[PDB]
């Protein structure tokens, strides 16, 4: 998270780390949307340009963490995925359209003071909260600046990072990029003149962009961290899987059919 800050403890209790099993590395973020189900980005599992095509025993998931590094004994769950559901009209050969994936946990999680689901948006919360200039909340463990790498890229926070970042209006998301935008994605970030900064970066992808509804005091996940040209460049914005529109798919696969 670029220009973010360390999160208080219990801040996104829905935050999930997507790790490779052996040898261990953090690959992506994801969120807990119930004691069985994790939403993350599709690019996290399958990116064919890069031969990435991860299966259920390449992968584990950690829940309830705050520090990136060391095992928080009392509070964290490692778990293995039972299944992996990637959208069929997911498009890796262009613009990462319909970039969403659902992961079925092996067994139910015991919910906790540090582990708790986030809600998916209804129609009305999408209608009331998705306006240009309204801010939502990205969190994650990824790099704090753009990098290449040396023997490691150096850029790894000890503790979970937060940034709050305003929704941006579509003809400016549009014109930020030569990439084809589709209604499945939105962008967010500060504009060159606004002189606040911040952005997801690598390793934050797959994670939640959440907004709090004042109406009921709940947090809703409106976005999944999808793609960027680099991290926090100016004149440039982060893009984000529009969860609500792909609510047709989500409820599909969870109820088997379901859409």
């Amino acid at each position: 998270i670029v220009e973010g800050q360390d999160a208080e403890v219990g801040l996104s209790p829905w935050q999930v780390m997507l790790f490779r099993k052996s040898p261990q590395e953090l690959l992506c973020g994801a969120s807990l949307i119930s004691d069985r189900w994790v939403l993350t980005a599709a690019h996290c599992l399958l990116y064919p340009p890069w031969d990435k095509n991860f299966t259920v025993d390449d992968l584990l998931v950690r829940i309830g963490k705050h520090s990136r590094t060391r095992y928080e004994r009392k509070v964290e769950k490692i778990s293995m995925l039972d299944k992996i559901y990637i959208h069929p009209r997911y498009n890796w050969k262009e613009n990462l359209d319909r970039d969403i994936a659902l992961l079925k946990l092996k067994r139910p999680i015991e919910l906790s003071d540090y582990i708790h689901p986030v809600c998916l948006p209804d129609k009305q919360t999408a209608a009331k909260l998705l306006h240009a200039g309204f801010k939502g909340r990205v969190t994650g463990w990824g790099n704090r600046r753009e990098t290449w790498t040396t023997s490691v890229a150096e850029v790894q926070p000890s503790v979970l990072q937060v940034v709050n970042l305003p929704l941006v209006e579509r003809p400016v998301c549009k014109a930020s990029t030569r990439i084809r935008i589709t209604d499945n994605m939105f962008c967010a970030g500060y504009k060159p003149g606004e002189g606040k900064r911040g952005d997801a970066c690598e390793g934050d992808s797959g994670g939640p962009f959440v907004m709090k509804s004042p109406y009921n005091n709940r947090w809703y996940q409106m976005g999944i961290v999808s793609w960027g040209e680099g991290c926090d460049r100016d004149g440039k914005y982060g893009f984000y899987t529009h969860v609500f529109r792909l609510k047709k798919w989500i409820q599909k696969v969870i109820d088997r059919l379901g859409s």
């Binding site: 800050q5 208080e8 403890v9 003071d113 209804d122 939502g136 709050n164 709940r218 809703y220």
Partner: protein, 36 residues
């Protein structure tokens, strides 16, 4: 999973349930009454 609210969902045990606010929520509520 449920849309709209799995009862306690998006109500964090350490924050809303203890009616404490986190260090950055007011920035968002700010952004709300900067718009509609």
């Amino acid at each position: 999973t449920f849309g709209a609210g799995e009862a306690d969902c998006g109500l964090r045990p350490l924050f809303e349930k203890k009616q404490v606010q986190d260090q950055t929520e007011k920035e968002l509520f700010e952004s709300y009454i900067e718009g509609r």
